[PDB]
Amino acid sequence: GYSVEYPQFSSMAKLKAFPHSEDGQLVRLLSWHEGVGLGGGLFKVSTSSTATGNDGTVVVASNGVRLLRVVNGPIWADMFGALPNSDIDSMPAVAAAYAYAASVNTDLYIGVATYKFKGSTPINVDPSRAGIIGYQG
Amino acid sequence: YSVEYPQFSSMAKLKAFPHSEDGQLVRLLSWHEGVGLGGGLFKVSTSSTATGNDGTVVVASNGVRLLRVVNGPIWADMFGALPNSDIDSMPAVAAAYAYAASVNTDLYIGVATYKFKGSTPINVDPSRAGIIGYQG
User: Fold this and answer.
1) How far is B26 from A43, CA to CA, in rounded Å?
2) Could you tell me where the DSSP H helices lie in chain A?
3) Type and span of the H or E element at A58
4) Residue B132 in 3-state DSSP?
5) CA distance linking residue B1 with residue A124, whole number of Å
6) C or N: which end of chain A has fewer Cβ atoms within 10 Å?
7) Minimum Cα–Cα distance from A64: chain B residue
8) How big is the A-B interface in CB pairs under 8 Å?
């Protein structure tokens, strides 16, 4: 049993590095970060798309081909590479995730964990577009 | 028999050469050999991370990038479009427009007849770039 339903990629880096060429093909991202099991999902390969990449819902491969996430529900921060319980600054990933979420009038969810916010750039929430919701409080 | 810049007669020849000197200026005579269209000056870049498009950003066979020195609008022949050809020109125009929109610059198309085949539309973003037929 070595067959798969969809072509599978273990990380965001592998998904971007592969030379995607079949328009409309559905591929599965197992996880944003290799082995973590978070942020994955199905992506639709599009060779015609000119959408700006955000490393979350719109992925631009190394060859310029776009991969569009199949999203059912709210946006989650781990779709943009946010990692639970890490020393790395999580504010850039949450800011990028919220920026997309607000652009499509959809709330941003954040998984149960502790996150570190560093730097000096505030997050400006537009309540007419999207909120930031901690999962389970 | 002397030239000011190294010269390449076609995009294929330009890509095949092992460019290695960062910042070197090279001349492309034409995108397609002998046609006399789409040529220009290119700067070799070992640091560039731009996605290759076979027009303004060229990735040589060894992976080294060549960046077109463009002053003015983008032309479709810079991406391999050929006037009055039976070959489908929509891929070249679509790729040229995609780059043009990325740099907020209009795309010009030289005077000719072009064939559009396939089934993929071109979506013009009026906030970024238009498609302009030269002399109408």
Assistant:
1) 40
2) 12-17, 91-103
3) strand A58-60
4) strand
5) 63
6) N
7) B51
8) 17
Rounded Cα gap, residues B8 and B13, in angstroms = 6
Instruction: Please name the helix (run of DSSP H) or strand (run of DSSP E) that holds residue A43, with its range, or none.
Output: strand A41-46
Torsion over CA: A58, A60, A66, A67 (sign): negative
Task: Describe the strand order of the beta sheet including B74-75 as a list of residue ranges.
Answer: B74-75, B107-109, B131-133
Query: Which residue type, as a one-letter code, is found at position A62?
Result: S
Give the whole-angstrom CA distance, residue B87 versus residue B109: 16
Residues of A whose CB is below 8 A from B125: 50
| Chain B residues whose C-beta sits inside 8 Å of any chain A C-beta | 51-53, 94, 98, 101-102, 120-121, 123, 125
Rounded CA-CA distance B136/B124 in Å is 18
Q: Residue A20: is it exposed, middle or buried by C-beta count within 10 angstroms (0-12/13-18/19+)?
A: buried
Could you tell me which residues are beta bridge partners of residue B109? B133
| Closest listed residue to residue B87, CA positions, set B123, B52, B55, B116 | B116
Pick the residue of A50, A59, A67 with the most B CBs within 10 A to test the interface with B by mutation: A50
Length of chain A: 137
Residue A118's closest CA among A98, A86, A92?
A: A92
Q: Give the one of B53, B123, B125 whose C-beta lies nearest to A64's C-beta.
A: B53
B8: its two tokens: 């390449």
Q: What are phi and psi of A59, to 5 degrees?
A: -110, 130
Hey, what amino acid is at A127?
Answer: P
**Which residues does residue A41 pair with via DSSP β-bridges, in sequence order?**
A29
Q: Which two tokens stand for residue A49?
A: 């798309």
This structure was determined by X-ray
